[PDB]
Amino acid sequence: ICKIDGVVFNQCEGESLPQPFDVAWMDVGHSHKIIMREHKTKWVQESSSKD
Amino acid sequence: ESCDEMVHADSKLVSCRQGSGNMKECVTTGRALLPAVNPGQEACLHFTAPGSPDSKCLKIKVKRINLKCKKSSSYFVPDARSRCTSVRRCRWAGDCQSGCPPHSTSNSFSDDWAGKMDRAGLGFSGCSDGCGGAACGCFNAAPSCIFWRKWVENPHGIIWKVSPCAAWVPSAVIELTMPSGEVRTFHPMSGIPTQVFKGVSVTYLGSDMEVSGLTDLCEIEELKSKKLALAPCNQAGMGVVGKVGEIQCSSEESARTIKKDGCIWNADLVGIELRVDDAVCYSKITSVEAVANYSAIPTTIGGLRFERSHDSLGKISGSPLDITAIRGSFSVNYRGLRLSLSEITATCTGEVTNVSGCYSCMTGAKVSIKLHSSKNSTAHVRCKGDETAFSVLEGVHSYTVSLSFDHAVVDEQCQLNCGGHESQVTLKGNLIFLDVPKFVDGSYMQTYHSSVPTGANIPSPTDWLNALFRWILGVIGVLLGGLALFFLIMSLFKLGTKQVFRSR
Amino acid sequence: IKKDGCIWNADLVGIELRVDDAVCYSKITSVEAVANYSAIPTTIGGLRFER
Ligand SMILES: *[C@@H]1O[C@H](CO)[C@@H](O)[C@H](O)[C@H]1NC(C)=O
Ligand SMILES: *[C@@H]1O[C@H](CO)[C@@H](O)[C@H](O)[C@H]1NC(C)=O
Ligand SMILES: *[C@@H]1O[C@H](CO)[C@@H](O)[C@H](O)[C@H]1NC(C)=O
Ligand SMILES: *[C@@H]1O[C@H](CO)[C@@H](O)[C@H](O)[C@H]1NC(C)=O
Structure with a gap:
């Protein structure tokens, strides 16, 4: 992967035509997104009052 | 510490650009080979760029080389007990005329047994014949249908961890430090991938050392008391009853319960006995301390002394006397990584302060070098006989490195260069000679021995x-x-x- | 290594877990792991296998 929607991500010295690519992602409130392939998730309820 | 065995296999193999404006790099891909080193050394991987004067290195740290085995399979065998119950009824109808199962009815549960529970476990719905008449409690001269159900339980909850293996390939530990600053550790095997991290795939190679009496051995360990023992274990699900290999299950957290959906048992693991509407069950499952060749944590079977080395992903080790193996070289491959270069190196000059050490021996001769510069770490020492690279800090500090010499009176002139600037240094001192240490009682080897220098073994008329x-x-x-x-x-x-x- | 063309029989990767970990260990051997592994220059017997 070199560029995502006109956003510089890596150094490839050249761009190609757009092509779909399936990959998971997550946000932390920053500008750009972070894609991850191998990840271990865990669902916790915690009995919070907001729910 | 010091470093040796430089490679420089893929120098000037970059296709970078202006570098984010001032100076950056994109990627470096190639392949190199690291030879075997003694336990407690560092193997540096110095890169060279055509534009930048100097670059950083990649140090490889090895602490212990233990004799471990692979992991053929993983399972947990819980402890089981003997539990059974029965019920006495009367025919009173045409349901128990002659026999209990007409042709194939195995569901011997009339919505009354306690088998519909979460803690029951595995069992077998069996049945037999009973008494019929007034002396037992009925009014018919015909045997009544008496069903019985047995199962196993686990009151305590002791969980065992068995891992069969029959390879016993050499392995070691590697404390790799990236040039960026990250330091991580991993355990590579002999020719097996070691969870490549950021492209680096440094692997270890062995010599396929034979074993004396290691044919059927395993690494069964205990979890609660942390007790280890060496005893022959079973194989995968298709097994034979008579030794270790009783009712297993899926995982440890699922080993507390002996229920279905994960637990596997073949047949004939609990017996049934009845005389008159009793249906008593006897115990035949043996504990872990029942089969032959059951060793303990200290094991000295043959020339190997199996100890218990505190380490992650493995708690089985062993070290015989000095073996002096043939070769233990490594193999490093790269796929993609980022590194920053300064290319703003200024005037730097160092000098020699002290010199000491052994002759051409294991630890070598340590020489202290003092430098002074503004750059953080840009240095590369090159001289005849041996080459040593190290890192420095900003300002004026003191550093100690080790080199290999083959002369008692070390009086030569080496060339020292930091970054782009170069200078000249000189060494002058007296050295001593140390041979291979001897064995003493009460001491046992921990990991291994690499090699000892015993080539000359002759008195020198010049020094003598x-x-x-x-x-x-x-x-x-x-x-x-x-x-x-x-x-x-x-x-x-x-x-x-x-x-x-x-x-x- | 996607399916529909790749072939594997069984028992090539193991699974290990103690408490919601599910760690996987490597068991595949490299090319320089089996016995009788020669190189480009080979002189086994009277034949001198060159390249
Ligand atoms: C125990 O080890 C001895 C010697 O290797 C062997 O002859 C014997 O069969 C082993 N016992 C079992 C139960 O495997
Ligand atoms: C160099 O001088 C002696 C000689 O070995 C040594 O003990 C000392 O620590 C060295 N100097 C410094 C500043 O470390
Ligand atoms: C040099 O080291 C100092 C302190 O360790 C650090 O603040 C600085 O960022 C380093 N310089 C570079 C170029 O990494
Ligand atoms: C390697 O070659 C020797 C001699 O031909 C043979 O005895 C041995 O079985 C071979 N090893 C393997 C793994 O085939």
Whole structure:
């Protein structure tokens, strides 16, 4: 992967035509997104009052 | 510490760009080979760029080389007990005319047994014949249908972890430090991938050392008491009853319960006995301390001394006497990584302060070098006989490195260069000689031994006969001393013969 | 290594877990792991296998 929607991500010295690519992602409130392939998730309820 | 065995296999193999504006890199891909080193050394991987004067290195740290095995399978065998129950009823109808199962009815549960529970476990719905008449409680001269159900339980909850293996390939630990600053550790195997991290795939190679009496051994360990033992274990699900390999299950957290959906048992693991509407069950499952060849944490079977080394992903080790293996070289492959280069190196000059160490031996000769510069770490020392690279800090500090020399009086002139600037240094000092240490009682080897230098094994006439007392004067003095000692021993022998002759 | 063309029989990767970990260990051997592994220059017997 070199560029995502006109956003510089890596150094490839050249761009190609757009092509779909399936990959998971997550946000932390920053500008750009972070894609991850191998990840271990865990669902916790915690009995919070907001729910 | 010090470093040795430089490679420089893929120098000037970059296709970068202006570098984010001032100076950056994109990617470096190639392949190199690291030879075997002694336990407690560092193998540096220095890169070279055509534009930048110097770059960082990649150090490889090895601490212990233990004899471990692979993991053929993983399972947990819980402890089981003997539990059974029955019920006595009467025919009273046409349901129990002649036999209990008409042709194939195995569901011996009339919505009354306790099998519909979460803690029951695995069992077998069996049945037999009973008594019929007034003496047992019915009013018909015909045997009544008496069903029985047995299962296993686990009151305590002891969980065991068994891992069969029959390879026993050499392995070691690697403390890799990336040039960026990250330091992580991992356990590579002999030719097996070691969870490549950021492209680096440094692997270890062995020599396929044979075993004396290691044919059927496993690494069964205990979780609660952390007790280890060496005993032959079973194989995968298709097994035979009579040894270790009783009712297993899926995982440890699922081993507390002996229920279905994960637990596997073949047949004939619990017996049934009944005389008169009793249906008692006897125990046949053996514990872990029941099969033959059951060892403990300290094991000295053959030349190997199996100890318990505190380490992650494995708690089985062992180290015989000095083996001096043939080769243990590594293989490093890269796929993609980022590194920053300064290329703003300024004038730097160092000098030598101290010098000491052994002869051409294991630990070598340590030399302290002092430098002074503004750049954080840009240095590359190159000289004849041996090459050593190290890192420095900003400002003026003191650093200690080790080099390999093959002469008692180390008086030469090496070239030292930091970044783009170069200078000259000199070494002057006296060294000593140390041979291979000897074995002493009460001490046992921990990991392994790599090699010992025993090539020369001959006295050097130059170093020897130096502090005793130019060559002509020394020969004359030796001759005079020899003649004096000859006259002395002749006088002593004459006196002895005179004393022996008379006074008989 | 996607399916529909790749072939594997069984028992090539193991699974290990103690408490919601599910760690996987490597068991595949490299090319320089089996016995009788020669190189480009080979002189086994009277034949001198060159390249
Ligand atoms: C125990 O080890 C001895 C010696 O290797 C062997 O002859 C014997 O069969 C082993 N016992 C079992 C139960 O495997
Ligand atoms: C160099 O001098 C002696 C010689 O070995 C050594 O003990 C000392 O620590 C060294 N100097 C410094 C500043 O470390
Ligand atoms: C040099 O080291 C100092 C302190 O360790 C650090 O603040 C600085 O960022 C380093 N310089 C570079 C170029 O990494
Ligand atoms: C390697 O070659 C020897 C001699 O031909 C043979 O005995 C041995 O079985 C071979 N090893 C393997 C793994 O085939």
